[PDB]
Design a protein around this ligand. Structure first.
Ligand SMILES: NC(=O)c1ccc[n+]([C@@H]2O[C@H](COP(=O)([O-])OP(=O)(O)OC[C@H]3O[C@@H](n4cnc5c(N)ncnc54)[C@H](OP(=O)(O)O)[C@@H]3O)[C@@H](O)[C@H]2O)c1
Ligand SMILES: NC(=O)c1ccc[n+]([C@@H]2O[C@H](COP(=O)([O-])OP(=O)(O)OC[C@H]3O[C@@H](n4cnc5c(N)ncnc54)[C@H](OP(=O)(O)O)[C@@H]3O)[C@@H](O)[C@H]2O)c1
Ligand SMILES: NC(=O)c1ccc[n+]([C@@H]2O[C@H](COP(=O)([O-])OP(=O)(O)OC[C@H]3O[C@@H](n4cnc5c(N)ncnc54)[C@H](OP(=O)(O)O)[C@@H]3O)[C@@H](O)[C@H]2O)c1
Ligand SMILES: NC(=O)c1ccc[n+]([C@@H]2O[C@H](COP(=O)([O-])OP(=O)(O)OC[C@H]3O[C@@H](n4cnc5c(N)ncnc54)[C@H](OP(=O)(O)O)[C@@H]3O)[C@@H](O)[C@H]2O)c1
Lengths: 254, 253, 252, 251
């Protein structure tokens, strides 16, 4: 009888009530993990939880705005109470970037983008580390973007923050290695979600982006789910400090 | 919970020992029909014996990847026996000898570039038409961490592994219209015969561990899961990608 | 010729080490340079030393973290020289060795602010002036830590990697204005900033072995590439990071 | 005169990028021996640079021939007393062709001339640079090393390979005080690249595709090479510098 690869593991996935995070949450649970979903809006949490509990998956949810230290610490407490520990963290939140010239980006946009996109995952990782230590180790996946390698103009704050996350991933992987905590990164290309709607709103704009990105199709949320589940599993025990691009062939880096 | 490579047919070059053998075993555990192959018939024999004795759908044939005739025959062998080809894993390398660039002969450069760079390109060429007939396929090329972080003393080998990064990219772009995916595995230090020089003395092992900033050396099976995943339709949105399996050893952003 | 003849350059954090070496070189290559840092006394001494070498260098206080200091830096240069051609952004927070587990939220905020946000806003403040000159050159100082972080400095590491992203995104954004944006990424240079890594002689030797280098860098080892990148001889180089690290591993 | 009294070999330096490099090095004070496959190209190259008052001489060297490489080194030593700089610039002309149509002969010639030859040419100069207390090597790769276009797979692979050669040589040769760096040009207007710019319609198409405002010229590559060859770049080794006018490459 083939065993579940995340049998008896406990996972937190932030920003997991829609799109990529939701797709990741579902797969981890499909792969045997107890999962706690969260996002900012309680009405988003309930529907995600209802949908996934509808499928017989070990899933519960709570509100957690990753920008709020209270929420982050409460997310960890909820999971530990319910399941007795934490083995996996997937950090997936990002601030919706407004398209504009760097000359029109305000200081408040910079502050919010760096806070939510860069500081928050660092502090969210800090919050889970002691619990992961108790279990003998763990796995962290940070979600950046192809934009880290290939920036488009108009999204400078967002671009910078996703590149920063390549460093956060590398530096945490080295620091947390003695605790047997692996730290990897998912860098999606253009995935069809509400987040990216501006870029596939029109069938003309979808075709224009495909030609620009040198891709045959846009990604779906579930195209990101398998690699994250693999990375979170003991089968990937010799992979740490690694960013995996899931971009359908769009240019990234060697 | 399905076999992720059910009904798929896979060639793995250089699959009678170490990483290649472990990839072969895992592809077959995940449902694939696998043809294993290497230069020496004796290794092919016991490779097949071992894996068939575990109940895996595996057969073998001799294939030196430097020989056009062997490459073509490997493909013919799989087509005849299974009806087509879905997956190629190119794993062969020339065993490099430690030496200065001042003592590397022209014949060493030629052989290294032939076997390590040209042969995977021609092997892939040999499978493309068969993958086209199945509606697409997956290719995985085995490079090395050396491609990003070369050690002195192995310059021809180092150059060939970096070249393979380029081969993976250029082929992924070329073959995308045929729905063929091309990705690359870049292992760090894995305990095999190939690498024995770097881990035969326990003092050398702990020395390498500190040099490479790792807590342990890899085993062959540490490479199998990612390759089996990349060869699957669960990775349909991953092509042109090199994945490093080096236990944290530095590579690149 | 004098490759930067009649060009006007701002270098932030330019009263010691790398930033001072850059200021000296730009000036030697013909440029009018305005040097600046937080402390007036540091500014005074840097200016005195360079003017005594007959170079066209004046100073002013500018803490790059303060909006008003950045605006005043530009205003000072525009009043004295008539415009701005070159910005080199060189300031960073001094990093303290410690675990991610001990790094406070306040350390994250300050590091991201001074090391990442400030360069972006300092660039914003020089863009309109560079436009009026027909274009210009921006060089951002990051670090080898951007590519090859060591443990104990995570916030600084993350901020330096962010700067690679900033360089690239700004290069693309400002290309239509004929503004080039490139980045210097130094390896271990012997300055006060890095003194924890070289003041003890046995530590220095240890870092050489670890970093795979034959010697540590000196501030002047960084100055030539920066002055080149600011010249019209580099007019087809933008979006580029150049590592000055004595062969220490970085990237392909 | 940053290169005063230095002796520079530049392969494939009778036209385009190699020629612009040879000119600049000579302008910066170096004695330069230019070379390529054809004597009339060499003679024209040499005549033009000598007419500018530069210390340049020439000789024939096909980089694919062991005897030519060694004789190039002997020629420079005989004339000037030693060798300080090597710039390796030669490449086989690539023609658009699907990987399915690339012959094994094209794979061999491309790996030979683009990868093995630079390595063996460096090997040829190393003992001489040792006698001078060190030296500087620059290898010309391409933006194609990072961002390959379809239809040029062998060339693309060979240019990525040169990134590795730069890195492995820089490490191996550092103890002999020999620095090794790489130039990676974007689209430069030369005969080598004519398929991508000769037609104006094609030029505009490539500019859009590469996200550049202009094509490069050969002299756009000269300064960085001369810099890298100078002692002002003594803390730079193992480094590839892209000269691509903003086209994407890498972080
Ligand atoms: N093309 C792409 O779609 C693409 C490409 C590359 C990278 N990414 C990355 O993928 C992530 C976005 O996911 P997506 O594309 O799947 O978007 P999506 O489908 O729109 O989902 C966004 C999710 O984030 C949650 N969220 C937003 N702000 C939050 C916060 N401050 N704290 C906690 N949760 C928050 C939302 O729920 P609430 O509204 O309830 O908070 C929702 O669950 C980002 O990290 C993004 O950079 C996306
Ligand atoms: N081990 C490591 O630390 C490490 C690290 C990075 C990369 N790699 C890469 O991993 C790959 C395999 O290494 P390994 O460590 O698993 O070696 P291994 O355990 O010694 O196995 C080598 C296999 O290659 C076969 N082989 C050798 N030359 C061949 C050829 N020309 N054609 C067909 N088969 C050939 C051998 O069988 P026959 O002798 O019967 O031909 C054997 O089955 C290589 O590409 C290597 O560069 C290894
Ligand atoms: N090994 C290395 O030294 C190394 C390696 C890689 C990168 N770097 C980068 O090089 C830069 C550091 O230069 P360095 O090593 O030359 O340091 P340094 O010799 O100590 O000089 C630091 C300079 O920065 C000024 N400064 C500090 N904070 C400032 C602020 N907020 N606003 C304006 N000026 C400020 C100082 O003057 P005041 O005290 O008067 O403000 C001083 O002139 C940083 O960007 C660093 O990340 C250095
Ligand atoms: N867009 C571009 O033009 C571009 C972009 C990236 C990289 N590059 C690189 O730039 C380098 C030079 O190309 P280019 O564009 O300057 O070409 P170019 O203007 O056509 O000049 C090529 C030079 O190479 C010589 N040559 C050709 N084969 C040779 C050989 N086997 N041995 C010695 N010399 C040889 C030619 O002289 P003879 O005919 O007399 O031998 C000529 O002097 C190549 O390495 C190429 O890969 C060019």
């Amino acid at each position: 009888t083939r065993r579940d690869p995340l049998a008896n593991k406990v996972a937190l996935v932030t920003a997991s009530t829609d799109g990529i995070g939701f797709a990741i949450a579902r797969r981890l649970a499909q792969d045997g993990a107890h999962v706690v979903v969260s996002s900012r809006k309680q009405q988003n949490v309930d529907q995600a939880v209802a949908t996934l509990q509808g499928e017989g998956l070990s899933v519960t949810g709570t509100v957690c705005h990753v920008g709020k230290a209270e929420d982050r610490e409460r997310l960890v407490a909820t999971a530990v109470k319910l399941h007795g520990g934490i083995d996996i963290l997937v950090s997936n939140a990002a601030v919706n970037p407004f398209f504009g010239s760097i000359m029109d980006v305000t200081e408040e946009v910079w502050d919010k983008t760096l806070d939510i996109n860069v500081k928050a995952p660092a502090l969210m990782t800090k919050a889970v580390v002691p619990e992961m230590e108790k279990r003998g180790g763990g796995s962290v996946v940070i979600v950046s973007s192809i934009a880290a390698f290939s920036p488009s103009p108009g999204f400078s704050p967002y671009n910078v923050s996703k590149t920063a996350l390549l460093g956060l991933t590398k530096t945490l992987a080295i620091e947390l290695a003695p605790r047997n905590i692996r730290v990897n990164c998912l860098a999606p290309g253009l995935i069809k979600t509400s987040f990216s709607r501006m870029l596939w709103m029109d069938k003309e704009k979808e075709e224009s982006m495909k030609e620009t990105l040198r891709i045959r199709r846009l990604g779906e949320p579930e195209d990101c789910a398998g690699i994250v589940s693999f990375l979170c599993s003991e089968d990937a025990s010799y992979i740490t400090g690694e960013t995996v691009v899931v971009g359908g062939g769009t240019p990234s880096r060697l």
